[PDB]
Design a protein around this ligand. Structure first.
Ligand SMILES: CCCCCCCCCCCCCCCCCC(=O)OC[C@H](COP(=O)([O-])OCC[N+](C)(C)C)OC(=O)CCCCCCCCCCCCCCCCC
Ligand SMILES: CCCCCCCCCCCCCCCCCC(=O)OC[C@H](COP(=O)([O-])OCC[N+](C)(C)C)OC(=O)CCCCCCCCCCCCCCCCC
Ligand SMILES: NC(=O)C1=CN([C@@H]2O[C@H](COP(=O)(O)OP(=O)(O)OC[C@H]3O[C@@H](n4cnc5c(N)ncnc54)[C@H](OP(=O)(O)O)[C@@H]3O)[C@@H](O)[C@H]2O)C=CC1
Ligand code: SF4
Ligand SMILES: [Zn+2]
Lengths: 95, 146, 157, 208, 114, 126, 48, 342, 134, 86
């Protein structure tokens, strides 16, 4: 989530933060640095892994035509989850 | 893939030594004045230059023309080449005279003390191509390398 | 603070209110954005009910609404009529072209934003902004004028 | 009958082809090429000397009567030695037909003005001079029309850059709008879009 | 090397038109300075006319000279008619432009451009 | 109208409105673009191209965008022949470098070579 | 929205904000990407 | 250098000059030219202002998007001074007032405030400090404000020893209080001058020359720690200068002598205006102090600026002071002023 | 230290192992205050009063032609000769080979990835070295 | 006027360089034995007028055109630069 650098400036979800000696920090004086606080990397990691009965699962992201292009995920490797390349949801084969 | 080396450890500013002997940033005016001042105290063998492996010919000839103007001839390269005999007088003495595309016309290639795979990977590919399509015979004097 | 400062502050409110309540824009429009300006004057929005009245003379205008694309050939003329407005005067930049060149930002013939030519008080986005979006910007100019503190600053000099 | 394909008739192609032969037989001194496209549009390509005779013939001849100049423009093709193609698009109300007359020019060879044939051409020829730098002989009043006063160059040439060479701003020191060399906070990003696979074999050019 | 002329058959005939245009520009400067209320002398206006003519002194092709004169007559026309504004006439003097230094060292310090 | 004799190089540089800096200090490259090695299609290796020498791009302090002062940074002109491109550069007063077109060499392909009795062309896999 | 409420999502703002232009809360643009080119850092210790 | 302040581009509006300047007093006469010269080469300019935002509006177009930063400040509040200088590599002080107000006297404006600004800039680690003073600044001056400037020069160098001090003569330009001031004597029909203006020598300087020199001093390596005198090319007696001004406005010039003690009393009367005084006692004193003869100190030429003659630029200031009859009169119709060498 | 340009940031001449001259083109300009390397030397010569006689890239390549005309013939193999003469002079050289076996500096793939300053500074090259070692 | 280096430029096929080509086959090995530490840089290149460059102390270079000369005239021309002056 949002952390602060030693200069006190918030660090973004892209890792951006001005140096302490960066003059461009002047632009936030008496104003503010806009930083979205809901990091997608943290929220997607909070989702539980989906357990399925097959070795191929299809993900369209939910909502049918409101999600993402339907893709098929291979679940043969038992040492890791199959992750959807669009929406980041994880799936695992039951056995 | 080594192009990402171009984004690291880059020299972006002139540097000179300060009172404490550390390198500090300075302007082009200042750094070139310091070098020009020393270049006028010395001449002859007192001035030399070593060219590295990624230097272009424009800078090489510019550097040579500069040192010659103070009567120095110690323009040197890090890579050795024998100076006995013809030395670098004749171009045929230090070139791949058969050319890269000439490898496809040979029938015996004798490699002496070289690992062409890693020293010239595309030249080694040309050898394998001839080995494959012309039945080229290859012999090596040197360490047994793949 | 003091009663002299209180009186000065109430006078700032009064003069500010007068300029808020009688904003007269120049009859001045450059391209498609001016069509939506007509629709702000039209009956549904009726800008005149807020006290906003077009006058054709720069000498009788308070606001310039840069409503459309500003070309290099037009730029000196726009600067001229801005300079000929008596003060206090305000500028509203309306639409992407005036805001920063818009669809024509990369043209050889177009000024990339009227704020290279005149100072701008309000930037109204859109291509064109709706008549309502322009009206919102006009009401944002009024609130800006409400914040002017010229007499308070004079008193503290 | 194939709902997505545009329907075609042969009648207009035949009519336009025959009139193309007619025009070529009457004006052999000037006519260099006649063609009818599969969009059924007739183009007469002429030597530049023939502009006034050709366009006078098409306006006034009883079997032509192209009395309305729809538009007059240029095309810059830098690979041609005569890089400017001059296009006249003409309308005949009598026969409800359209024709295109094309000639060419280079940077140092003016075309004749056709204002004596169509007064409509007056501003169009000014536009061609302004945008492409092609001069017109015997024009009543030839001068820039779209560009700014004192503008240098002809911006519709292919080698004139999109954003030009100069930009404008107000300078408070001199108290006026001033012209300065163009400097862009974001450069226009050039996209390479063409597919490296051929799209239309009907237009494949000889391998040479 | 056989070309159509525009107006002048040779560079000598073209030079005659150049001198006529120069006379017209020379006589116009005082009227323009007065009518546009330019903050320059008449001498400074005529020196600028001279400098603009000598920017093209190297041209030998009679056709190019013909077209330079044609354009020079147009610029004169929009100046006499006062179609040009003061901003337009003052553009010839580049009064806010810091000129690029011409020596190698100054360009080396500034940046990478030749 | 009659013809006149103009025995000099065609040079239209005074009529183009280009600033002098962008005539004399520029270098154009006349070349046929190489095939994009990511694709086998060859349709983009058929025309001659003229492009200008690349100049400085820098970071915009506000947004980080790529800024430029080079008005010719995007100019690309297409030509049907090397000689057309050379002619166009010369009349515009641009110094140019011309690179010869590269055609892939003709090759001998023999599917039967994959199964040779006694040659190294025999493939170990299909 | 009383009888037809919108879908609940955890990331949706719970507190609406009006236009905050020309206040200390106004948006200020800035590049969101990190430094691309890295300089060489000279040694801290001297050399003789 | 931090990579963000390496100069890039070709010196235009979208370029990066490397200069990060805080310009105090940017909302007055000299300041608008200084901001313009900084902003046109692609500098970041921090502009502290205490006036209404309406009064800074003309500065907003002087720089590319994001290159001008307007901050509120109070000369009393020491935190707003530190807030305004904490990111800049040069600080330029142009604070001044030609009269004293209820809340700020000449010591406040020319001593206390400059010292506070220089103090904060030294502790923030600002690389360069440029302070504008006056050619005739002196501890033994008849003018109270010119005495204040002399003390301020010494207090500024006591906290920022490397400070660059700029000493201009009277500065003429479109918004000056010099050529416009004398041109406006037409309203009183006759022009008083102490000793008829024959005992005062002036060497006025053009505003765009001063700003150009000030902006060149932000980058000049050889400028640090020095005092510069920014004067125009020519010296004039106050009589001939005023006569030339009335010649350029084509207004009837009727000079008459007036003793200084009567003249100072009139200055006190006009000084009672609660708005911007038309003149003050100090203004009268400064008009009749002669500019000091050039010796020793470097000038505009040392900073790469050629002084612009008053004869080249006066009409752009004085044409608006003509009636309709004389509006279109050209520069050459006015006879130039006679010059002195002492 | 005088910061110079890398091969991606200059129009510079290189000759390959066949003797073929080829030139790079500028793709991006040098970072920071770095400059084209021949221009640094040309600037240095002026400060030192020994100005070199060329101010442009074209002029420096005219000089390259004076010193060796093959260096400006781009993409050409200029044929050589006189190996016989070189071998005659080699015959007179009285030195003897040592018994040390011929061992190339690079023996395995792990030695291939990092051989100059650019590849030593590449983080991709470091990943390659680690992968083929661990 | 201390000689530092000689450069010989010639074509490989042009008849104008036939003399310079003969000079190299005949005299070069003898010349290199006489001056084992003098760089004599022979640089062939197609379609070049043959030339002789002599570089002296402090970067002074003199040029001699060997075009359409004989092997002895090239020997004569070359001995001048090595021997001294004329
Ligand atoms: C001379 C003629 C003057 C008569 C008009 C004076 C009243 C004007 C203000 C008004 O009526 O609008 C109320 C306004 C109306 O609100 P508003 O104008 O801000 O909002 C309008 C928008 N809608 C419709 C959405 C509400 O009240 C205010 O909030 C603004 C305060 C203005 C105060 C004016 C000065 C106060 C009196 C000071 C007198 C001098 C003091 C001496 C000590
Ligand atoms: C039919 C209508 C006819 C009559 C119309 C009358 C309308 C006016 C109604 C009364 C309001 C008058 C206010 C002044 C009008 C605005 C003029 C203006 O904006 O100038 C700004 C000027 C600007 O001042 P500045 O000094 O900040 O500006 C300096 C220079 N520039 C602009 C570059 C920044 O301010 C003034 O001069 C204000 C002077 C008036 C002060 C108010 C009266 C004094 C009250 C003191 C309190 C006494 C308390 C006693 C009890 C305890
Ligand atoms: N002839 C001349 O003009 C000469 C001028 N100088 C000096 O150069 C500098 C600028 O000259 P000029 O531009 O004519 O001066 P101006 O009076 O035109 O501008 C003065 C500046 O100082 C600011 N200022 C004044 N008092 C205060 C204060 N109490 N608190 C905060 N800010 C304040 C003003 O801000 P606001 O507008 O908000 O009050 C304004 O921006 C001054 O130091 C002046 O003495 C030197 C030689 C001659
Ligand atoms: S912003 Fe859009 S609607 Fe407005 S003038 Fe420009 S193109 Fe037209
Ligand atoms: Zn998904």
């Amino acid at each position: 989530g949002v952390q602060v650098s030693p200069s006190g400036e918030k660090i973004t979800h892209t890792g951006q933060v001005y140096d302490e000696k960066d003059y461009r920090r002047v632009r936030f004086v008496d104003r503010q640095k806009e930083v979205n606080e809901n990091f997608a990397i943290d929220l997607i990691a909070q989702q539980p892994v989906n357990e399925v009965e097959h070795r191929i699962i299809a993900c369209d992201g939910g909502g049918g035509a409101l999600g993402h292009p339907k893709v098929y995920i291979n679940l043969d490797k038992e040492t890791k989850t199959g992750t959807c390349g669009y929406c980041g949801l994880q799936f695992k084969q039951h056995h | 893939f080594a192009y990402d080396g171009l984004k690291r450890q880059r020299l972006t500013e002139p540097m000179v030594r300060n009172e404490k002997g550390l390198l500090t940033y300075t302007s082009w005016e200042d750094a070139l004045s310091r070098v020009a001042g020393m270049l006028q105290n010395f001449e002859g063998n007192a001035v030399a230059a070593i060219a590295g492996g990624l230097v272009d010919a424009e800078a090489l000839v510019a550097l040579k023309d500069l040192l010659n103007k103070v009567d120095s001839d110690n323009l040197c390269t890090e890579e050795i080449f024998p100076t006995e005999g013809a030395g670098t007088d004749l171009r045929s003495n230090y070139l791949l005279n058969t050319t890269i595309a000439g490898v496809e016309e040979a029938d015996v290639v004798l490699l002496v003390g070289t690992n062409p795979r890693f020293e010239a990977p595309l030249f080694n590919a040309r050898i394998r191509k001839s080995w494959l399509h012309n039945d080229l015979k290859v012999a090596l004097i040197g360490s047994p390398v793949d | 603070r003091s009663r002299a400062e209180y009186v000065v502050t109430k006078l700032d409110d009064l003069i500010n209110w007068a300029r808020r309540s009688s904003l007269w824009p120049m009859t001045f429009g450059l391209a498609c954005c001016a069509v939506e300006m007509m629709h702000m004057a039209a009956p549904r929005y009726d800008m005149d009910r807020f006290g906003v009245v077009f006058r054709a003379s720069p000498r009788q205008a308070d606001v310039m609404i840069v409503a459309g694309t500003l070309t290099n050939k037009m730029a000196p003329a726009l600067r001229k009529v801005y300079d000929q407005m008596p003060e206090p005067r305000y500028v509203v930049s309306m639409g992407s072209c005036a805001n920063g060149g818009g669809y024509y930002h990369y043209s050889y013939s177009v000024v990339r934003g009227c704020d290279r030519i005149v100072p701008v008080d309000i930037y109204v986005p859109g291509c064109p902004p709706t008549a309502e979006a322009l009206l919102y910007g006009i009401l944002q100019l009024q609130r800006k004028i409400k914040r002017e503190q010229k007499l308070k600053i004079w008193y503290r000099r | 009958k194939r709902p997505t394909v545009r329907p075609r008739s042969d009648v207009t192609h035949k009519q336009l082809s025959a009139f193309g032969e007619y025009v070529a037989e009457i004006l052999p001194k000037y006519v260099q090429q006649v063609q009818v496209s599969c969009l059924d549009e007739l183009e007469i390509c002429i030597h530049p000397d023939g502009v006034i005779p050709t366009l006078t013939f098409l306006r006034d001849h009883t079997n032509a009567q192209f009395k309305s100049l729809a538009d007059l423009t240029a095309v810059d093709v830098p690979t041609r030695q005569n890089r400017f193609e001059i296009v006249y698009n003409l309308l005949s109300l009598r026969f409800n037909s359209r024709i295109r007359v094309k000639t060419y020019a280079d940077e140092l060879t003016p075309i004749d003005s056709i204002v004596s044939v169509h007064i409509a051409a007056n501003w169009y020829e000014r536009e061609v001079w302004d945008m492409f730098g092609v001069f017109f002989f015997n024009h009543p009043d030839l001068r820039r029309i779209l560009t700014d006063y004192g503008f240098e160059g002809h911006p519709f040439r292919k080698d004139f850059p999109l954003t030009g060479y100069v930009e404008l701003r107000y300078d408070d020191e001199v108290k006026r709008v001033v012209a300065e060399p163009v400097e862009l906070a974001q450069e226009f990003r050039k996209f390479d879009l063409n597919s490296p696979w051929e799209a239309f074999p009907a237009y494949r050019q000889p391998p040479e | 090397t056989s070309v159509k002329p525009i107006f002048s058959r040779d560079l000598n005939e073209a030079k005659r038109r150049v001198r006529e245009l120069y006379r017209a520009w020379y006589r116009e400067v005082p009227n323009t300075v007065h009518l546009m209320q330019l903050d320059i002398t008449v001498k400074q206006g005529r020196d600028k006319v001279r400098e603009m003519f000598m920017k093209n002194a190297h041209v030998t092709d009679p056709r190019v000279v013909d077209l330079l004169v044609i354009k020079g007559k147009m610029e004169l026309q929009e100046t006499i008619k006062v179609w040009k504004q003061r901003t337009h006439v003052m553009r010839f003097f580049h009064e806010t432009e810091t000129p690029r230094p011409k020596d190698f060292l100054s360009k080396f310090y500034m940046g990478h451009d030749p | 109208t009659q013809l006149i004799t103009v025995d000099e190089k065609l040079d239209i540089t005074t009529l183009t409105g280009v600033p002098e800096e962008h005539i004399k200090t520029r270098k154009v490259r006349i070349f046929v673009p190489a095939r994009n090695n990511m694709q086998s299609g060859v349709n983009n290796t058929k025309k001659w191209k003229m492009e200008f020498d690349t100049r400085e791009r820098w970071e915009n302090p506000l947004m980080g965008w790529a800024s430029t002062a080079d008005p010719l940074s995007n100019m690309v002109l297409t030509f049907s022949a090397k000689e057309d491109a050379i002619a166009f550069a010369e009349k515009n007063g641009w110094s140019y470098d011309v690179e010869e077109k590269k055609v892939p060499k003709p090759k001998s392909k023999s599917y039967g070579a994959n199964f040779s009795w006694n040659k190294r062309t025999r493939v170990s896999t299909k | 929205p009383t009888t037809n409420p919108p879908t609940a999502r955890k990331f949706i703002w719970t507190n609406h904000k009006f236009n905050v232009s020309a206040t200390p809360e106004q948006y200020v643009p800035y590049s969101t990407t990190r430094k691309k080119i890295h300089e060489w850092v000279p040694p801290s210790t001297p050399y003789k | 250098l931090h990579h963000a302040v390496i100069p890039h581009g070709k010196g235009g509006r979208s370029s990066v000059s490397g200069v990060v300047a805080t310009v105090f007093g940017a909302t007055g006469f000299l300041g608008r030219y200084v901001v313009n010269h900084l902003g046109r080469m692609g500098s970041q300019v921090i502009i502290p202002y205490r006036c209404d935002v309406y009064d800074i509006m003309h500065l907003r177009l002087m720089g590319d998007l994001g290159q001008l930063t307007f901050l509120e400040w109070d000369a009393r509040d020491k935190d707003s001074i530190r807030k305004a200088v904490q990111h800049s590599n040069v600080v330029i002080n142009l604070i001044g007032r030609e009269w004293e107000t209820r809340n700020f006297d000449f010591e406040d404006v020319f001593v206390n405030i400059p010292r506070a600004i220089a103090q904060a800039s030294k502790e923030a680690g600002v690389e360069r400090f440029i302070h504008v003073s006056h050619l005739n600044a002196s501890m033994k001056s008849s003018s109270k404000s010119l005495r204040s400037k002399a003390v301020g020069e010494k207090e500024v160098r006591s906290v920022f020893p490397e400070a660059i001090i700029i000493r201009p003569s009277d500065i003429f330009g479109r918004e000056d209080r010099f050529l416009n001031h004398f041109a406006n004597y037409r309203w009183f029909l006759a022009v008083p001058l102490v000793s008829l203006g024959f005992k005062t020598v002036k060497q006025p300087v053009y505003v765009a020359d001063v700003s150009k020199g000030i902006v060149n001093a932000t980058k000049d390596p050889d400028a640090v720690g020095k005092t510069f005198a920014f004067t125009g090319p020519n010296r004039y007696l106050l009589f001939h200068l005023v006569k030339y001004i009335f010649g350029m406005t084509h207004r009837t010039f009727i000079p008459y002598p007036l003793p200084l003690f009567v003249y100072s009393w009139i200055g006190k009367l006009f000084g009672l205006s609660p708005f911007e005084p038309w003149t003050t006692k100090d203004k009268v004193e400064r008009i009749h102090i002669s500019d000091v003869m050039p010796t020793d100190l470097p000038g505009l030429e040392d900073l790469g600026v050629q002084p612009t003659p008053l004869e080249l630029k006066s009409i752009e200031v004085l044409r608006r002071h003509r009636t309709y009859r004389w509006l279109s009169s050209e520069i050459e119709e006015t006879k130039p002023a006679k010059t002195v060498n002492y | 230290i005088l910061p110079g340009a890398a091969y991606t940031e200059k129009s510079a001449t290189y000759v390959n192992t066949e003797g073929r001259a080829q030139q790079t083109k500028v793709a991006v300009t040098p970072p920071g205050l770095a400059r084209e390397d021949w221009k640094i030397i040309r600037a240095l010569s002026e400060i030192a009063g020994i100005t070199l006689p060329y101010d442009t890239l074209d002029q420096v390549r005219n000089r390259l032609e004076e010193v060796s005309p093959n260096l400006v013939r781009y993409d050409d193999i200029e044929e050589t000769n006189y190996f016989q003469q070189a071998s005659e002079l080699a015959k007179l050289v009285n030195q003897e080979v040592l018994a040390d076996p011929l061992v190339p500096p690079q023996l395995t793939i792990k030695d291939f990835y990092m051989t100059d300053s650019i590849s030593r500074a590449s983080q991709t090259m470091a990943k390659c070295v680690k992968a083929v070692t661990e | 006027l201390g000689l530092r280096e000689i450069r010989v430029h010639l074509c490989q096929r042009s008849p104008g360089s036939q003399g310079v080509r003969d000079f190299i086959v005949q005299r070069y090995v003898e010349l290199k034995k006489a001056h084992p530490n003098l760089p004599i840089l022979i640089r062939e290149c197609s379609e070049v007028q043959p030339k002789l460059w002599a570089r002296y102390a402090f970067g002074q270079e003199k040029t001699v055109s060997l075009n359409n000369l004989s092997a002895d005239e090239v020997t004569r021309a070359m001995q001048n630069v090595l021997s001294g002056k004329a």
